Structure formats: C-alpha cells, structure tokens
C-alpha cells in the first residue's frame, strides 16, 4: 500500500554546494556570563588515535574505570588578535563601526592582508566609547589570525584571518579587556580560552568529494532485484509526479558533495598539551609529525588533515563540564599496519 518511510537526507544543509571560505565562520556565539573573554580559537587537524581514560561521568555505573576513547589530534599554536572591531545598532541589524589595530604585525601577515601603515588607534577608540555613551554599541569582536608557519606539517604560510567574539561582564569591561589583549601584540593561546574537560563546538569545512550520485549524496537505494541488471543501477525512479509539471528541489539529485561547512556540536576537550605526547610512530599519515601546542578532541572533526578548524565554547551543552579528565594512556602506535 506503499509502506511509509522518512525522506532520504536532510534539507537542512542546503543548498549542498561548495563553501565560500575554506575557513569556517560561526553564525552564533556563547552568551555573556562569566568574566570578559574571547569566545573561540583555531588550529590545524593532524589525525586520529585513542587515549585511555578514567570514566568521569558520576552517573556512569562504570565510574572510575579504564576506558578507551577516540581522539582527533589538532595543532593549536597561539593565534594573534590584530584588532578590535565594534558594531553598532541600527534598525537594519548590526554594522561595523570601526577597528582599532596594533603595529606589531607578524612577519608574514602581508601574504593575505594589505597591512596598515598609518592608523589612528585613539580616535577610533574615541568614536567607539562615544557610541557606547549614546547606547548604540553592539557587540565587540577581534580580528584574529594564525601562524601556519608554526606548524611544519602545514605547508601553507599565508595566515588564515578570521573574526572571533568577545563577551564578558559588562560592555565597558570587555571593551577594555579587548583593547588590552590587542595593544600588546594580540598573542593568546588555547589555555587562555579553553580548559580540558570542557565542551566546545568544532566548525570546519568537510572533506571534499567532487560530484557524486544520489546514492552517495542522499542515501537513496541502488536498483534491486531484476531492476539492477536493466541499465539503471544508481539513479532514482523519478524526478517527480506528472503535476506539478516540474522537478522540485526536495528531490535528491546529482551534485557537489563535501567541502561544505558544518559546525559539529558538543565536542569534548580531553587534554590541551604541548610537545609530542600525541604523535604517532612513522608519522601522522598524509600529515606529518606533531610537536608543540595542541588539543585532543573526542570523536571526529570536520575536514581532512591540514584543514583549519575553529573552536567555540559549546553554546548548547547538554552535560555539565567534568574538568581535567584523567589521562592514563595515549597511544603512539603507528597508523599503518
């Protein structure tokens, strides 16, 4: 009688096309609770390995026992805030007002930017505080970028620039906290924001797979029984009904797959170390060797090895953060074998 069945694939990650920036861009931000702070970082994906742990969860009957967890290694060398951007409130949303920069620029920030030569860090500041007096000062975000140079395994040097948000106690407080972070040289690190045990959201541009059929792109079925030896093996029965005399978009078709942005929710941070504690024997295949500032992530992460992935304190966490979990054994055993 036509047994029911949910559709094939989600209409929520559309239109399934190539992404505009190989660098992820957050749409939402964490609310302003605790003290003033930057709400995000970044680093380059290195690879996969397991870390043995002590069951943390106080509601796990197994609480306190051994437990092997999968971990995606990621290199998170210190990023640099090069400016403070301030948006104002208009009846047409939020618009940038101005930017306050520094002078100390990374030896290679010119590979991407037309690095400033003569800026006014006082008058812009001035204009900012004035907007605040008036009551039209919308949130404050810093223009940040990385040091791809800091990761040998990463071939690129040309910095991936991107804007993260600062939200603290009052607005005044984080305006200053912002100013100061910048004034110096903008240098900051993972520890400054995150802490092992905590929950974060990892956004990234998925592994790209070129054009693909609907079977692999929408999870439709290949032809079955006798049908499959007929001249159609991996294509749907129809594009639609007679009327409406047209093909909908809701119908699964051939197209671009992968290299789309996804902000994968609630990722746990196992540990944030430095050095080669994580690195594998032989070397992280198609990636290289890790040694330096990093972060261990529970589960999978968007994108292949070498891709930039951004962090943000989970905005919709389900569990309370069970800080600094005990790390009993991080496997270094080769990935080939």
């Amino acid at each position: 009688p036509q047994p029911s069945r949910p559709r094939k694939g989600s209409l929520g990650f559309g239109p399934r096309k190539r992404s505009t920036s190989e660098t992820p861009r957050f749409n939402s931000w964490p609310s302003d609770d605790g003290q003033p702070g930057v709400q995000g970082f970044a680093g380059y994906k290195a690879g996969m390995t397991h870390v043995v742990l002590v069951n943390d969860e106080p509601n796990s009957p197994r609480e306190g026992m051994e437990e092997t967890v999968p971990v995606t290694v990621i290199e998170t060398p210190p990023m640099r805030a090069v400016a403070l951007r301030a948006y104002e409130d208009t009846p047409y949303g939020q618009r940038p007002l101005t930017e306050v920069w520094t002078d100390e620029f990374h030896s290679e920030l010119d590979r991407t930017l037309d690095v400033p030569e003569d800026h006014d860090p006082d008058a812009a500041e001035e204009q900012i505080r004035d907007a605040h007096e008036a009551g039209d000062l919308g949130d404050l975000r810093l223009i940040t970028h990385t040091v791809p140079d800091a990761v040998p395994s990463v071939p690129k040097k040309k910095p991936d620039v991107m804007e993260t948000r600062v939200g603290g106690g009052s607005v005044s407080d984080r305006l200053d906290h912002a100013l100061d972070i910048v004034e110096d040289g903008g240098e900051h690190a993972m520890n400054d924001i995150f802490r092992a045990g905590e929950y974060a959201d990892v956004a990234g541009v998925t592994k790209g797979k070129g054009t693909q059929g609907p079977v692999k792109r929408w999870g439709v079925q290949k032809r079955k029984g006798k049908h499959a030896r007929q001249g159609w093996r991996r294509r749907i029965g129809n594009l639609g009904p007679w009327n409406p005399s047209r093909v909908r978009s809701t119908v699964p078709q051939q197209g671009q797959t992968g290299y789309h942005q996804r902000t994968e929710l609630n990722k746990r941070l196992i540990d944030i170390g430095e050095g080669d504690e994580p690195t594998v024997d032989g070397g992280f295949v198609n990636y290289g060797e890790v040694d330096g500032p990093y972060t261990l992530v529970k589960g999978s992460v968007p994108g292949p090895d070498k891709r930039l992935v951004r962090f943000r304190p989970a905005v919709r966490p389900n569990d309370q953060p069970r800080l600094d979990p005990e790390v009993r054994y991080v496997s270094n055993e080769s990935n080939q074998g």
Binding site: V52, Y329, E333, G337
Partner: protein
C-alpha cells in the same frame, strides 16, 4: 596484555577476543594472526613470530 598466537605485546584499545566452542579464550592483536591460525599454522613454525624468536 600479550597475544595468544604471536606473543607480541598487544596495544591497549586494539584487538579481538575470540571465544571457542569449549569456552577457551584467545586474544589476537591482528587479523593477520587470526587468519594465519585459521589455516592450520602453529606460531612456533612461523619465523616472523616472536613465539618462534
């Protein structure tokens, strides 16, 4: 743990625990070892095997 076929130390968070018809337990560190036993070979004769070394 140690492999009940080859004898090489087994990497924690890796492996299969085969359970026989009688009840006996045999931990293998790899698929290579499993299939090398499914043929009829004894770890002693295989040179690359630590049991044999």
């Amino acid at each position: 743990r140690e492999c009940d076929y080859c004898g090489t130390d087994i990497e924690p968070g890796t492996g299969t625990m085969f359970v026989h018809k009688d009840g006996a337990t045999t931990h293998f560190c790899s698929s290579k070892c499993e299939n090398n036993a499914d043929l009829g070979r004894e770890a002693r004769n295989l040179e690359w095997t630590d049991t044999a070394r």
